[PDB]
Subunit: 295 residues, 4 copies
């Protein structure tokens, strides 16, 4: 046998960082979960019990905290690039570092209509994520995303005109509920290294904001012909607004809300135009994906 | 042997309801998860395979949907009282109905600074709950709560002066992070039946709002001596602002954020006043509870 | 306002212990999650920021580990009684200790038909639990349980003869799938203190084994008239076999498996006696409970 | 813009199937969760609201149940190949089907030492999985796996000799706990179509059994130099025992169990050779991966 691929490191590293403005008293907090996986000339740790090539995963953990102490942790695209670059430069035999960061929300509280200097609320489990691949000789590849954005519209979704054959029982509809959990990813042009990532730092938060804005507005305003058609509209606009993005990926479940026929009970009318009470379905769910790039 | 207690019913009943304003086009959605458990003269279903006393749990499910079709589902205190009252009045041998409702957030979206008529976002997993116990001959007992409200303050928490003996290693501190997931419950005076619950309908949403407001403001503004002292302040104010509440209960985890000593690395200073990077601890956690009532 | 009830402590304390037999080389492992909550003359920590009455929850944590170091952690009824007794005896102002223990499975591996001296597998998420309430002047109250025991029978469950009215749509059946997750609790006679708990130590593992055995055999062999009737049979036998148990509680979900009518497709017959493919339902679910005691 | 990739279908489809032996009364049950995602000439559903190219995901659901009714659901490699082949043959414009199946355990109960004909227990959350990619013109690519296999050894794990620099604090050890959740995948040689998959049907269950056996025995018997070295041993043996496998992948977390220094308390000795009580760490965790193929 032979090792064909190998990577190893530390997962689920929870990190908090606070910034304290000494002049204003305003504090700002950041919280993330980090994974770093290394690749390189490490195959002998697998085949020959040669631990000399292993940067201990506990040391990877230490390095995450030390890097957060010495560097900004925002935007996460930059933090991840700094972290990944560290491993490939520090260790001659480590040739790639794969950095995944999940950013958790801590939104400043408004108390009596005024922003509080040190109190925060988690307004949802929506995450902002990055996957940063730092590869010696091949620059830095960054995928940015939002996930866990849960939305519902109560009308202005339709689904008709689909293929009908002997496997088909679904009725066409011209008015249904549409609910999903948005997973949206934008893939940046390859960067040649940390300097180039730094040169674009303002674009990371601005593109996250654009993606979020475009997602919500397109979902709210498109009288949707299908999940497929709505998500493509989202992706085309994000590409039109940031030319340093090469592709946009969406992965969207269709979380079904079924009508409930109550006509067996006292002739109760609860379908079609009279539909008021629905049964949300936990499973199964449609799953719709696409990757859109530039023509 | 003998049956000492017995209750049965349907759990995890997901329910959605939409209201459509025909004049304005504005739609409003509600989503909940409901459990109804019945008690009564049902012991022979257990001891003698006498299913004649069983209102099938599938029929309990049907009844939840039918009740939601015919009645408002908000505030949940009212919906639960209507539902529970139905079972004890409909069925001579059913003497208590226990109704648990978890309300899920669907907050109207703001698109370009304007509220959207039919699009909603789940801004957090925070829940609004009720437990309604409808007992023949004993009225309706309602416990209202909020849960899953996750908060953090980055300073203005302290913990010193606690008992110190041979089991103690914790250092006193005058400045620490405090983070918790708030579970707060207010217990109403017994209501004599559905009419009395209806007579107080506006107080249910207003008291939920007060509890939420008081929780957030007290957490943000109290320079906390302990979780115990902060939560008692919250409970006293809620009791002062709604005299139809008899008790307030809080259950608060202390989700620890540990300092990380980095001085072993190049003399890095990351403790005490220099503490910037912390390690959030998934477990264990302090757990602090109290029930406060009127003197 | 006034404090009506208060308890506090440390939750989610994960504990592992190993026993090493020096002569045979055989090692045995135990893993649990522990919660200890204390009550007593602690109200001033809530009302007057008097932390002097607080045994720090970090010290409660230390005490759990120290107690596990110095004492057997099996059976958990004993460990919990030792732990709870410690707090009420050590601290004059602490008058009750509430100890919850969840025991995780580590079953010795069989390698080539022979038991391995130090290798273990988690054969399921089934738990063995205890709730031990140590109350000064009132002895030690122990509730023992098993939970997470997931079972299915593919026939020899029936459900007919239930109440039928205008809310009823369920069809009677004489042959259905029955699947549940068993939560079974046995409540011991009050013990006067640790000596009495110690005097009964062999009965704790033996009664857990009986409960488990009786549950599985009754589920497998009863041609069930209803969940209610089957669970009552289980509880009566456990009471008959351990006279130091005062009550037995079961809480059983009915995890439904729905038939799928495929006759719309090429006249496929998949219902009734031809039922082969089913759709397991994640929600809703029946929930059936009872507490059985001695006549 | 342009669609670069697109796939869509139905996820989280829960399926149960029973086989009833008419002669012996013995019933056997199977339960899985299925995802089917289709690719093909479907881009106009995204770009032009052309739903005519969409095989509705509800119809994909129907097709899963119909296929389970008409075909064996075991081994899952075969079921998945039948299912995927159906879509690419039935629909001219569908050119790939991606089938993921998670198989849930239902192990026959032993009641009084004898196998029960229709009663089953879920002995763990360990899963058996397949990923089957049916691609027109390119055959059928199958990845088989086991996941969720949770194990612990209490000694005969070591970790020393690793790189030590200014980021390193971990102490070398010659005796530690090793615990992991095994995710192991074996990748079959490409099959030219369903006939070739059928020709190998006995090898699917036998190779799953070998992988499981080899994993457990290697974990139990290797005095492990590192997770890397132990997992490579597992993968080499599986490749040696099934020549129709091209690669083996392992993904193994190192779930840490930390020693607890109790010497601050009455000189208690709980480290090194005296280590008896440990604190299992929920996070972070090492994560070690490798893909092994043939030299
Ligand atoms: Na390098
Ligand atoms: Na009644
Ligand atoms: Na005491
Ligand atoms: Na095709």
């Amino acid at each position: 046998s032979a090792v064909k691929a190998a990577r190893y490191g530390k997962d689920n590293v929870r990190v908090y960082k606070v910034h304290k403005d000494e002049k204003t008293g305003v504090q700002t907090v950041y919280e993330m979960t980090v994974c770093v996986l290394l690749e390189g000339e490490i195959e002998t740790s697998y085949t020959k019990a040669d631990n000399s090539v292993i940067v201990a995963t506990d040391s990877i953990k230490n390095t995450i905290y030390i890097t957060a102490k010495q560097n900004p942790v925002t935007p996460p695209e930059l933090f991840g690039s700094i972290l990944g670059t560290h491993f490939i430069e520090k260790y001659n035999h480590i040739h790639a570092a794969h950095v995944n960061i999940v950013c958790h929300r801590w939104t400043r509280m408004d108390i009596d209509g005024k922003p509080h200097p040190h109190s925060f609320i988690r307004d949802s489990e929506e995450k902002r994520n990055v996957q940063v691949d730092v590869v010696e000789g091949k620059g830095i590849d960054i995928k940015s995303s939002l996930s866990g954005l849960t939305v519902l519209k109560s009308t202005n979704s339709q689904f008709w005109g689909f293929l009908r054959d002997e496997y088909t029982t679904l009725k066409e509809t011209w008015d249904r509920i549409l609910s999903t959990d948005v997973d949206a990813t934008w893939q940046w042009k390859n960067f040649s290294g940390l300097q180039e990532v730094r040169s674009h730092v303002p674009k990371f938060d601005a593109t996250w904001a654009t993606a979020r804005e475009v997602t919500l507005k397109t979902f709210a305003e498109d009288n949707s012909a299908s999940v497929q058609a709505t998500m493509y509209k989202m992706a085309e606009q994000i590409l039109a607004r940031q030319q340093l993005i090469e592709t946009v990926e969406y992965s969207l479940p269709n979380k079904h809300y079924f009508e409930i026929d109550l006509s067996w009970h006292k002739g109760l009318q609860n379908t079609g135009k009279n539909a008021e009470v629905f049964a949300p379905q936990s499973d199964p769910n449609g799953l719709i994906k696409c990757t859109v790039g530039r023509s």
